[PDB]
């Protein structure tokens, strides 16, 4: 029972595609054409954080909107004061190859991981006056590409072993394992309510997961190459992905289909990171051509360009108040834009 | 006070970069890698640190990475050299083993992240190759060949099909070495070939070449 069972799979896939097209009344660009364009956005480099001596791979804002972590493969995990450009902490890492880092929404912990297949958790609020290693989560067989705290107790990680995992940091074991992808999972994005999350993988597909259950609720396709970046819309009813085919796409969770594409003919490089502004009107994408493009998220127009890095921009984040944007790069510099 | 803490951190961050710039970073690919690792084992990803004649080497073995190399290969851009390990005694084995090494060697050698990175080729298991070459012909692996059964000619033919896979010429070197497990020269050869890489890097930085 393989050929007929597989034919049933195609028949159900065809039925799914018919359902998505059936509900697609009008494209987003037809109804949003009545909106006034954002116009032009010129963001100046307000701060330049220079303490890293290698390529910067990941950065994360603290919920304070003032503190942020960065990870470089010089073996360092630095916490910055973005107002005074001061260095709060400098955490040395056991393994230099880090591909991700996270900040606990409470501000007491920092997480990072990479080519060692381990998500280490660091305590930022020790009584002895130093940042310690509080936990080393070791359950993946492939490199760790993203990780984000749900609280001070449980964290979700993606990996190159094609699976995502939810962890209990107090015990150090996977509470649930999320399976179903075919290629490496490159990114994940927590929903604002922190009961759902999306993950994009190297099979050019994004899947929506339920944290408590452990099952795929929906699957999203359309990208022609690996999905390197993914971010949730501020209201949590949509998310945007950045792929290697030089396109970003906005996917709706209710309509179960893509809304619009953010691509330009002169852009022939892969997207390394994506982000949204506080109002979800600006999609900020980092590109491999050494600069970040600001996109009008409702009209699919490039509203601005953050051209200030000598190498490709690896990471991209917006503060929880929308005041600033941070961009890291392989040129070893983080820059804050406003 | 807080500003003075940031400056103290800068001092130690910049002192760490100086220490990390005096070390030779080697990427180990391949086969016989475990032989090479165990040969210079003086002291997801397995990192081996050893010291030879005042140089500190860091080998990074990525054998236990079952993922898409395209995603993490760029992390090793900037290594001094790549040690590629091939087993001579595996050409009649199984598609063909010797053509799997050739397919992988062409991938890394012509990789865009490794345009200037020299390759140290280790053709391992020469004792088992010289016994099987007299027992079985090399035509099983290379249908086009003349010196049917002889270690010297067969090995030279193999070594020539690995250095002819190099498309970038005058951009980097390939330092080929024949090595049995009993060999006790491997570390010296890596040190000798690394010293050549360093010197060529100094002259290229000054624009002299």
């Amino acid at each position: 029972e393989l050929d007929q069972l597989r034919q049933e799979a195609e028949q159900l896939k065809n039925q799914i595609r018919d359902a998505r097209k059936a509900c697609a009344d009008a494209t987003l660009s037809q109804i949003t054409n009545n909106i006034d364009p954002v116009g032009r956005i010129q963001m100046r480099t307000r701060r330049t954080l220079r303490g890293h001596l290698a390529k910067i791979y990941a950065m994360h804002w603290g919920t304070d909107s003032r503190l942020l972590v960065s990870a470089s493969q010089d073996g360092k995990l630095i916490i910055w004061d973005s107002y005074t450009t001061n260095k709060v902490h400098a955490i040395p890492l056991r393994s230099s190859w880090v591909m991700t880092c996270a900040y606990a929404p409470s501000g007491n912990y920092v997480a990072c991981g990479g080519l060692d297949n381990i998500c280490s958790i660091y305590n930022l609020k020790t009584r002895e006056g130093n940042v310690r290693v509080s936990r080393e989560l070791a359950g993946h067989t492939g490199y760790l590409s993203c990780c984000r705290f749900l609280d001070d107790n449980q964290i979700v990680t993606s990996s190159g072993d094609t699976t995502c995992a939810l962890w209990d940091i107090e015990t150090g074991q996977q509470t649930t394992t999320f399976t179903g992808h075919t290629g490496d999972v490159m990114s994940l994005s927590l929903a604002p309510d922190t009961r759902l999350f999306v993950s994009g993988a190297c099979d050019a597909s994004a899947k929506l997961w339920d944290v408590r259950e452990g099952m795929c609720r929906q699957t999203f396709t359309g990208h022609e190459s690996d999905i390197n970046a993914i971010c949730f819309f501020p209201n949590g009813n949509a998310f945007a992905t950045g792929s290697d085919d030089a396109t970003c796409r906005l996917f709706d969770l209710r309509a179960d289909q893509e809304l619009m594409t953010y691509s330009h003919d002169n852009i022939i490089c892969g997207i390394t990171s994506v982000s949204f502004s506080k109002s979800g009107r600006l999609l900020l994408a980092g590109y491999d051509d050494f600069n970040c493009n600001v996109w009008d998220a409702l009209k699919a127009d490039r509203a601005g360009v953050l051209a200030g890095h000598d190498n490709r921009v690896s990471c991209l984040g917006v503060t929880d108040d929308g005041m600033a944007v941070a961009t890291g790069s392989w040129d070893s510099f983080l820059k804050i834009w406003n | 006070a807080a500003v003075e803490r940031s400056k103290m951190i800068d001092r130690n961050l910049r002192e760490d970069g100086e220490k990390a710039a005096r070390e030779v970073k080697l990427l180990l690919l391949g086969s016989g890698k475990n032989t090479i690792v165990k040969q210079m084992k003086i002291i997801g990803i397995v990192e081996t640190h050893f010291t030879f004649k005042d140089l500190h080497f860091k080998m990074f073995d990525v054998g236990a990475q079952r993922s898409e190399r395209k995603k993490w290969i760029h992390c090793f851009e900037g290594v001094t050299a790549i040690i590629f390990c091939v087993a001579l005694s595996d050409y009649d084995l199984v598609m063909n083993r010797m053509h799997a090494s050739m397919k992988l060697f062409d991938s890394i050698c012509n990789n865009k992240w490794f345009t200037d990175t020299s390759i140290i080729l280790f053709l391992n298991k020469k004792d088992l190759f010289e016994e099987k070459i007299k027992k079985s012909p090399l035509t099983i692996c290379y249908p086009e060949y003349a010196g049917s059964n002889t270690y010297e000619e067969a090995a030279a033919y193999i070594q020539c099909q690995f250095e002819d896979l190099n498309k970038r010429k005058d951009t980097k070197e390939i330092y080929t070495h024949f090595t049995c497990s009993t060999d006790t020269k491997n570390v010296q050869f890596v040190f000798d070939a690394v010293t050549d890489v360093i010197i060529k890097n100094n002259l290229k930085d000054c624009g002299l070449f």
Epitope: R66, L67, D81, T84, N86, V88, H89, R127, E128, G129, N130 | A1, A2, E4, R5, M8
Partner: single-chain antibody, 232 residues
Amino acid sequence: VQLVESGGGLVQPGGSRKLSCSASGFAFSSFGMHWVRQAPEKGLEWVAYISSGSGTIYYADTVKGRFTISRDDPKNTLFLQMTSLRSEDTAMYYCVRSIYYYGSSPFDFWGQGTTLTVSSSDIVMTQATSSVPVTPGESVSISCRSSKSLLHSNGNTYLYWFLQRPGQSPQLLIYRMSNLASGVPDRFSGSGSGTAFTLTISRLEAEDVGVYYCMQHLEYPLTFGAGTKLEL
């Protein structure tokens, strides 16, 4: 965490003494250390300061030129070499650890103190009263004043509240006027306007009795309040 000092005792005028403060159980090299003294039944008085790494050193003019703050990071020891000891130098000197980064609590732990006895511009901080009788379960309010405003352009108000229970060393309660220290019950609270500050204690308990101190960290020399005592 443990700061234990030694080197105190009785000395004749004109002599010199060296106090020590050995640290145990924390990253001593990453902390700026202060010397704070408290004359018999008078109040708190900051003496000096040495930065982490020995970069900065500060003194109070009352003792500047005769004392010196030295540090030995490998041994985790802090010294106070004192010379020309007058009668006014009689006091209990305390070793206090301080760390300054964004969000830190820079007066969190105090040593046990060591008694020194000698035989026979600045911001003024005033505490309105010196004794306040109350019974357990009643909300109390303490207040103190400053000459300058402690509110900076940062938005930080550098006012600190301490509590020295009978027979013990001071313990931090509030740092920067609104932030509760670590390990203190959440019934304490601090508020102010920039020059007028207050400390409100809800559901007062038996062990909340002692002299409350209000300190400014806006500028050097660091100055303490007179000291408000809660009576029961």
